[PDB]
Design a protein around this ligand. Structure first.
Ligand SMILES: CCO[C@H]1CCN(Cc2c(OC)cc(C)c3[nH]ccc23)[C@H](c2ccc(C(=O)O)cc2)C1
Length: 287
């Protein structure tokens, strides 16, 4: 398939046709909505923390293309290393390591103007999307997409079928350490002796006011794709996992600590063995 390409100047799901909207069937505070990405005709990639651990398949509804209709969910695949309770002993009340999950749909999606797959790292789709030679390796795709730099990226927020594109910078050069250490401003992580325990090698970091004023995520953006845009093609590099400031509830707090208001995303280059295995029959051509 031709991944990560728009399919006229339309709006919302015409501009971001890989976006998926997730709703928690029995909602509570902190457990209302999530986002996801269409990655193949049968699969939506999201965050594991969006589901109940028991009876995952009946814990959410998912929609694509801004449709009212919910898609039938056949199976939910959690990354095997995901465990929100895994570091309670270290004073880490919620641990978001490996916070990725795949929704297998019962019915094949039909791609159209409002439903299209986004490109995934270390696939032939991404080689073609980036107009790269057939000798391209996974490591070369990583150098092209995640150089040791502040990386221009974007994520999308949803409200009543309206999508808002937000430009952010991934701190992957000399700001990476500072970005990660700002996990300590997250309520509930402020007393962890060693903050590297909360921010593992699975994470990319955005947010703050340098080099630009990055918008922050809200809980409801959880599971949405963190995207790199090159020459009219969109490549997913991350899954939105967790934030330091919920700017949907707490714009007071971002204004108090704007230099440290970070967002954390699961790096898809760090879960490739799991992606490649679960998606091996989806014709994506993993390297
Ligand atoms: C136990 C450790 O919890 C940490 C990490 C999770 N966050 C909530 C959270 C997500 O949770 C999965 C997911 C996304 C995408 C989020 N985007 C922004 C916040 C946020 C917590 C929190 C709670 C309240 C406020 C506030 O009042 O500002 C800010 C952060 C701190």
């Amino acid at each position: 398939s031709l991944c990560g390409m728009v399919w006229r100047k339309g709006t919302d799901y015409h501009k971001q046709p890989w976006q998926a909207k997730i709703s928690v069937i029995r909602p509570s505070k902190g457990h209302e909505s999530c986002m996801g990405a269409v990655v193949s005709e049968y699969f939506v990639l999201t965050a594991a923390h969006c589901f109940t651990v028991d009876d995952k398949e009946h814990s959410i509804k998912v929609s694509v293309g801004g449709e009212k209709r919910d898609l039938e969910i056949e199976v939910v695949l959690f990354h095997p290393n995901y465990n929100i309770n895994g570091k309670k002993e270290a004073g880490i009340p919620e641990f978001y390591d490996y916070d990725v999950a795949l929704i297998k749909l019962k019915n094949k999606l039909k791609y159209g103007q409002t439903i299209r797959p986004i490109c995934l790292p270390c696939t032939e789709g991404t080689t073609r999307a980036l107009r790269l030679p057939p000798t391209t390796t996974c490591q070369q795709q990583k150098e092209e997409l995640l150089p040791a730099q502040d990386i221009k990226a974007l994520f999308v927020s949803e409200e009543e079928k309206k999508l808002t594109r937000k430009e952010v910078y991934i701190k992957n050069g000399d700001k990476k350490g500072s970005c990660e250490r700002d996990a300590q401003y997250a309520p509930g992580y402020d007393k962890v002796k060693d903050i590297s325990e909360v921010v593992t090698p699975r994470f990319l970091c955005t947010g703050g006011v340098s080099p630009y004023a990055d918008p922050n995520t809200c809980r409801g953006d959880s599971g949405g794709p963190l995207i790199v845009h090159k020459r009219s093609r969109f490549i997913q590099v991350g899954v939105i996992s967790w934030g330091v400031v919920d700017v949907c509830k707490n714009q007071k707090r971002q204004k108090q600590v704007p230099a440290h208001a970070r967002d954390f995303h699961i790096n898809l280059f760090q879960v490739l063995p799991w992606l490649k295995e679960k998606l091996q029959d989806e014709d994506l051509g993993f390297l």
